[PDB]
Amino acid sequence: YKYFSGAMDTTSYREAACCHLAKALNDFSNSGSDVLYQPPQTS
Amino acid sequence: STFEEAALCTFLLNKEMYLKLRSDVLLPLTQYNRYLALYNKYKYFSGAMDTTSYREAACCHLAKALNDFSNSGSDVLYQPPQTS
């Protein structure tokens, strides 16, 4: 989904947002530092 | 078949297609006028495909391409607008 070029209403956008959230959580688990989270930016 | 399909379709724009599709039977001039400035807000954030920010954004891009063709006369490929 880091190379996706579709639309926001598609389930692909929701899944990409979930992927970004999961990646942020995984990085937090390996860092343990408070970080600000925002909805994924357009790619 | 419809202007929406023309916006969706990927094709080589030329003099023939420009002359055929410019007719007001498919797109009135009044509707064409409003298709030249709305993308300035839509370019900053995403939107649903059926909403104005995607459909009418692609329509605005197609209208701008038609205006450029009328001011340049160069046959160029038409593609769906790239995501921000």
Strand and helix map with partners:
This is part of a larger assembly, with two copies of chain A.
Chain A: H1 11-29
Subcellular location (chain B): Host endoplasmic reticulum membrane
Function (chain B): Plays a role in the formation and maintenance of double membrane vesicles (DMVs) replication organelles. DMVs are formed by nsp3 and nsp4, while nsp6 zippers ER membranes and connects to lipid droplets.
Protein name (chain B): Non-structural protein 4
Description:
It is classed as viral protein. Keywords: Double membrane vesicle, pore complex, nsp3, nsp4, RNA transport, viral protein. The entry is titled "SARS-CoV-2 DMV nsp3-4 pore complex (consensus-pore, C3 symmetry)". Chains A, B: Non-structural protein 4. This is part of a larger assembly, with 2 copies of chain A. Chain A is built from 1 helix and no strands. Chain A is 44% helix and 0% strand. The radius of gyration of chain A is 12 Å and the shape is elongated. The termini of chain A are close together. The first copy, chain A, is mainly alpha-helical and 43 residues long. At the A-B interface, loops of A face loops of B.
Q: How would you summarize what this structure contains?
A:
With 43 residues, chain A is mainly α.
List keywords for this structure.
part of a larger assembly, 2 chains, mainly alpha, 1 helix, elongated, viral protein, Double membrane vesicle, pore complex
- Helices of chain A, by number, come to 1
Topology, number of strands of chain A: 0
Describe the main β-sheet of chain A briefly. none
Helix coverage percent of chain A: 40-55%
The SSE order of chain A reads H
**Strand proportion of chain A:** under 5%
Distance between the termini of chain A: 9 Å
> What is the oligomer described by this structure?
part of a larger assembly
Structural class of chain A: mainly alpha
Shape of chain A: elongated
Q: Radius of gyration of chain A over alpha carbons?
A: 12 Å
Biggest interface and residues each = A-B, 10 and 11 residues
Membrane topology (chain A): Multi-pass membrane protein
Subunit structure (chain A): Interacts with PL-PRO and nsp6.
Subcellular location (chain A): Host endoplasmic reticulum membrane
Protein name (chain A): Non-structural protein 4
